[PDB]
From a paper:
PRC2 is composed of four core components: EZH2, EED, SUZ12 and RbAp48, although it may interact with several other proteins. Each catalytic cycle of PRC2 transfers a methyl group from the cofactor S-adenosyl-L-methionine (SAM) to the ɛ-amino group of H3K27. The catalytic machinery of PRC2 resides entirely in the C-terminal SET domain of EZH2, although EZH2 itself is neither stable nor active. Here we report the inhibitor-bound crystal structures of the wild-type (WT) and the oncogenic Y641N PRC2 consisting of human EED, human SUZ12-VEFS and engineered American chameleon (Anolis carolinensis) EZH2 (AcEZH2) subunits.
Interestingly, two of the prominent primary oncogenic mutations identified in lymphoma patients, Y641N and A677G, are positioned in or around the I-SET. Tyr641 and Ala677 are highly conserved among lysine methyltransferases, are structural neighbours in van der Waal's contact with each other and form an axis around which the I-SET ‘swings'. In our attempts to structurally characterize Y641N Hs/AcPRC2, we noticed that the solution behaviour of the mutant three- and five-protein PRC2 is significantly altered relative to the WT: the mutant is prone to dimerization. Monomeric Y641N PRC2 when analysed by HDX-MS shows increased baseline dynamics (of EZH2 subunit Fig. 6a), suggestive of the significant and far-reaching consequences of the substitution. Nonetheless, Y641N HsPRC2_4 does remain sensitive to inhibitors currently in clinical development and the inhibitor 1 reported here, suggesting an overlap of the conformational space between the WT and the Y641N PRC2. This is further underscored by the crystal structure of the Y641N Hs/AcPRC2 in complex with inhibitor 1 reported here. The HDX-MS results suggesting greater dynamic character of the Y641N PRC2 and the proclivity of the mutant to dimerize, further emphasizes the far-reaching structural consequences of this specific substitution. Hydrogen/deuterium exchange mass spectroscopy (HDX-MS) analysis of the oncogenic mutant PRC2 suggests that Y641N substitution has far-reaching consequences on the EZH2 protein dynamics rather than just creating a more spacious substrate-binding site.
Numbering used by the authors:
A (entry chain T): 561 to 688
B (entry chain F): 68 to 426
C (entry chain A): 9 to 71, 81 to 124, 166 to 180, 193 to 199, 219 to 246, 260 to 308, 432 to 472, 517 to 733
The structure:
């Protein structure tokens, strides 16, 4: 109190109204979001289908900030709900299945998830 | 062109900026401003090469040193305004009618190398800094619309920037040998400008959210070998210079690629030509143009003043005229064409002003 | 059946022909570009000159004093000098990007050649009154570009997506190759910003071309459950699938197949525990077990805390490290870095010099304030960078371990503004957090509201 503070992102001063709140210190800074999708596109030997799945997966993981292996089964379910409409609309369902098996290969998700997600994607397409 | 006058400011320090008021009505006398030391001087142009000293301002700070200035107007008052800035990284808005410093902006982490007002919106000010970033301000609503810099911003000091004719894009250049394109016609940028005008501090406890623009719409290091200290658009083509005694006319992408269709991933540049001159291998030496973009002028470290006719097709066949005067032997920091191109003013390191009149 | 000296002259002639033509083409394209452009200038400068005409901007008039001297003998002018009222300036700061976690940073043309080859072939064709003699001649004239053997195979001139119209038919390891080599098992991301070493082959070890390649893959995951492989392929049935079948050191995971974690193991050599990421036996004696605490985990009684490690959300199942993902305040007080439960910090000019960081809310002794984030650089990149840094009297470099340095200069978080002091109120503790070294900033003593933060940079500078 009685000291003048500044926003870390603009160096502009704090008004008394704002009451010592500087919060452009968000979990997923926007730029990391564009940096990741930009870096994936830069790949020569990777196709446009595997590219769009990788980008969408990363943005999902970055939004929710998953940190445990135990979170991976729920991470696929949340992905198929939040990004399902986009997966269908962009024709990426086969590359998505390919991602689900990659996850199982990395011992991160159960076989039961590998198909519960696939079941949920079809249930979502039938809604069109 | 003929050297019709030469003036000398008392401070005896380099004059880094010279700018004509291109907002003067038809009939009104030709007024230009000069920045140098911690001073801001205003002059009126008259017949028989007579220059009349009008106004002079001084910063209360002795350690302030102004590098740049820009003219605008109050849309609801019809008053000309003069923005100035330099070493102390502070923008001042001077009203020469009121004879007051009506506004000021502190935000830049270092010195301001260039100030530019949007060609269509007088309230939108672009400031270029040594702190590696550009900043778009809305001087009506006193807010920071955006900060152009970050992860894919300038890795070193930003030396110059320019809006295009319609104000849809900015092209910046700096000490990192880079030229970066920043589209201000994007939905994000237009929404930010719209929202800035709506921002009323007296109706909220929350500050205005500035857009952080980390990525340009194009970037290149392939035009010059050293720092780039000047950039201006020539239509949809770019004119930029370094210390390699040449102004390079180039464009993003391949020969046939339309600027508005250039992707951020674009790895190509096309060099259309160059304007050759000598003894201008020192930095912070700026070229300028005619309102109608038909003339281009640049000064030497030895006081030679080069003027080219851009109207001719290939730049290798470009008509060059070398303006020289026996008494003019200092480094020409900047040039300025009167709106009608009847007058060309040049400012030097020795605190001198040189008036060159057309015909 | 034509002379080598002759063929070399033909190369030189055709090169200079093609090159002169391409040049003349570009010369025109340019003169066209300039014209097309000048109409754009005219059009637009008119738009501006019109806008200008509908404005009647007021003229400037005459106004401690200053004077102006004319060398071209015009009369001296004297005018009063108005003083611009002092404005206070903020301390110096250069551009930087916000980080929430660390960010790793690493330390003739083909167009004309083919034209010329074909332009010469056109002459070999005219010699009736892709030949080998044409390659030996170009190689002779352009030896650098390669031998006639090299230029022959150079002249001749990614797996297609399964969802695309051109979906070819390859193995399981070719359909998955991208996914497998680009995925980071450690942070669950493709082309991650922290882990540069690609996943060891054991980590990813548990009709139409679009159906055929999908079959080879699915019989690697599922094996003989064709009644389920059919459900996934969709466009087929068990019957159809059945028939098809018959036709301090940095931690890095270890992978020594058919070998134990002995004196020859990198983990063991670096004197590091095997983590959940290693490919060794589930029974590996060098693995870190985790803690069975009920709560707290902030005393030597907790093996995690004692080992200068945060809790593992996959091993520490009883303390609360594995739970309540929505909340940042949990039962386990040893997982603040990983969950990112930082404290509110405020930026203001320092009471010493430059910019400083001030805590918003009170903090107890040894309580976690913030993580010190930045770019992860090699000890060499740090040396290169340091040369530049020394010009500005900077040192925002902080050792992480023997291999890496976090550089908060280009990017980091608010704690980059904590100043140096030999009498600090904060300390830096590098902790092992789910296989990653992270610099934690904790209170040295109790800190009250609005207090400036200081830490002793010297302790973060010794790799002595
Ligand atoms: C972490 C920032 C910090 C921390 C604390 C506790 N207190 C503070 O006041 C500040 C602010 N601060 C101090 C002054 C400063 C200088 Cl003098 C040079 C700098 O960085 C060079 C800039 C040219 N560099 C380049 O690479 C150019 C030439 O391309 C190298 C790094 C920087 Cl990054 C800074 C800066 O931000
Ligand atoms: Zn990773
Ligand atoms: Zn091992
Ligand atoms: Zn191991
Ligand atoms: Zn082991
Ligand atoms: Zn515990
Ligand atoms: Zn534990
Ligand atoms: Zn615990």
């Amino acid at each position: 109190h009685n000291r003048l503070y500044f926003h870390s992102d603009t160096c502009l001063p704090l008004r008394p109204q704002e009451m010592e709140v500087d919060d452009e210190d968000e979990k997923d800074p926007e730029w990391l979001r564009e940096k990741t999708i930009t870096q994936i596109e830069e790949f020569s030997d990777v196709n446009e289908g595997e590219k769009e799945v990788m980008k969408l997966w990363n943005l999902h993981v970055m939004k929710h900030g998953f940190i445990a292996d135990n979170q991976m089964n729920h991470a696929c379910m949340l992905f198929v709900e939040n990004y399902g409409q986009k997966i269908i609309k962009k024709n990426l369902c086969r590359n998505f299945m390919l991602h689900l098996v990659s996850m199982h290969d990395f011992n991160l998700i159960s076989i039961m998830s590998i198909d519960k997600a696939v079941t949920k994607l079809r249930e979502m397409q039938q809604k069109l | 062109f003929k050297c019709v006058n030469s003036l000398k400011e008392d401070h005896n320090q380099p004059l880094f900026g010279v700018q004509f008021n291109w907002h003067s009505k038809e009939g009104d006398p030709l007024v230009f401003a000069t920045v140098g030391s911690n001073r801001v001087t205003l002059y009126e142009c008259h017949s028989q090469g007579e220059i009349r000293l009008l106004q002079s301002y001084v910063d209360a700070d002795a350690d302030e040193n102004f590098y740049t200035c820009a003219w605008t107007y109050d849309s609801n008052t019809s008053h000309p305004l003069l923005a100035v800035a330099g070493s102390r990284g502070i923008i001042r808005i001077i009203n020469p009618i009121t004879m007051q410093c009506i506004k000021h902006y502190v935000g830049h982490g270092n010195a301001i190398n260039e100030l530019k007002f949007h060609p269509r919106d007088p309230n939108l000010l672009l400031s270029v800094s040594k702190d590696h970033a550009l900043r778009l301000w809305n001087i009506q609503t006193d807010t920071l619309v955006a900060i152009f810099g970050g992860v894919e911003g300038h890795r070193d000091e930003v030396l110059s920037a320019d809006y295009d004719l319609l104000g849809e894009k900015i092209m910046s250049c700096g000490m990192d040998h880079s030229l970066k394109l920043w589209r201000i016609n994007s939905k994000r940028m237009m929404n930010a400008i719209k929202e800035s005008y709506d921002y009323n501090p007296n109706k909220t406890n929350r500050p205005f959210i500035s857009q952080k623009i980390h990525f340009p719409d194009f970037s290149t290091r392939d035009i010059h070998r050293n720092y780039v200290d000047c950039v201006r658009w020539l239509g949809d083509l770019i004119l930029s210079k370094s210390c390699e005694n040449a102004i390079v006319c180039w464009k993003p992408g391949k020969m046939e690629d339309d600027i508005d269709k250039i992707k951020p991933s674009e790895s190509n540049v096309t060099i259309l030509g160059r304007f050759d001159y000598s003894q201008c291998d020192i930095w912070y030496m700026r070229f300028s143009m005619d309102f109608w973009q038909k003339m281009l002028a640049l000064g030497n470290q030895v006081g030679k003043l080069y003027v080219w006719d851009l109207e001719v097709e290939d730049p290798h066949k470009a008509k060059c005229t070398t303006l020289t005067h026996h008494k003019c032997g200092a480094a020409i920091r900047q040039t300025s064409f009167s709106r009608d191109s009847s007058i060309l003013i040049a400012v030097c390191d020795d605190a001198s002003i040189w008036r060159w009149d057309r015909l | 059946e034509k002379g080598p000296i002759c063929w070399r002259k033909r190369v030189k002639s055709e090169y200079m022909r093609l090159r002169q033509l391409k040049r003349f083409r570009r010369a025109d394209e340019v003169k066209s570009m300039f014209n097309s452009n000048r109409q754009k200038i005219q059009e637009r400068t008119e738009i501006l000159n019109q806008e200008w005409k509908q404005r009647r901007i007021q003229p400037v008039h005459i106004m401690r004093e200053c004077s102006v001297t004319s060398d071209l003998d015009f009369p001296k002018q004297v005018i009063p000098l108005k003083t611009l009222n002092a404005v206070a300036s903020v301390p110096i700061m250069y551009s930087w990007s916000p980080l929430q976690q660390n960010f790793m940073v690493e330390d003739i043309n083909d167009e004309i050649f083919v034209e010329l080859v074909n332009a010469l072939g056109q002459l070999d064709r005219r010699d009736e009154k892709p030949s080998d003699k044409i390659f030996e001649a170009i190689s002779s004239m352009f030896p650098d570009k390669g031998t006639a053997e090299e230029l022959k195979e150079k002249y001749k001139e990614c797996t297609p997506n399964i969802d695309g119209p051109n979906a070819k038919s390859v193995q399981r390891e070719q359909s998955l190759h991208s996914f497998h080599t680009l995925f980071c098992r450690r942070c669950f991301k493709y082309d991650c910003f922290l882990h540069p070493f690609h996943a060891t082959p054991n980590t990813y070890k548990r009709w139409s071309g679009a159906e055929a390649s999908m079959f080879r893959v699915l019989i690697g995951t599922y094996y003989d459950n064709f009644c389920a492989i059919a459900r996934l392929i969709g466009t087929k049935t068990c019957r159809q699938v059945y028939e098809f079948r018959v036709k301090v050191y940095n931690y890095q995971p270890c992978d020594h197949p058919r070998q134990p974690c002995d004196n020859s193991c990198p983990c063991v050599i670096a004197q590091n525990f095997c983590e959940k990421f290693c490919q060794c036996s589930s029974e590996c004696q060098n693995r870190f077990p985790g803690c069975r605490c009920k709560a707290q985990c902030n005393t030597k009684q907790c093996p995690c805390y004692l080992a200068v490690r945060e809790c593992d959300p996959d091993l520490c199942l009883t303390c609360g490290a594995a739970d309540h993902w929505d909340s940042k305040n949990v039962s386990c007080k040893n997982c603040s870095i990983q969950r990112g439960s930082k404290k509110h910090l405020l930026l203001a000019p320092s009471d010493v010099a430059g910019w400083g960081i001030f805590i918003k809310d009170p903090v107890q002794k040894n309580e976690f304030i913030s993580e010190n984030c930045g770019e992860i650089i090699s000890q060499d990149e740090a040396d290169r960078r340091g040369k530049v840094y020394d010009k500005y009297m900077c040192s925002f470099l902080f050792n992480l371990n023997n291999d890496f340095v976090v550089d908060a200069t280009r990017k980091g978080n608010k704690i980059r503004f904590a100043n140096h002091s030999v009498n600090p109120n904060c300390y830096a503790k590098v902790m092992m957090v789910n296989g990653d070294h992270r610099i934690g900033i904790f209170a040295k003593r109790a800190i009250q509201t609005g207090e400036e933060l200081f830490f002793d940079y010297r302790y973060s500078q010794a790799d002595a």
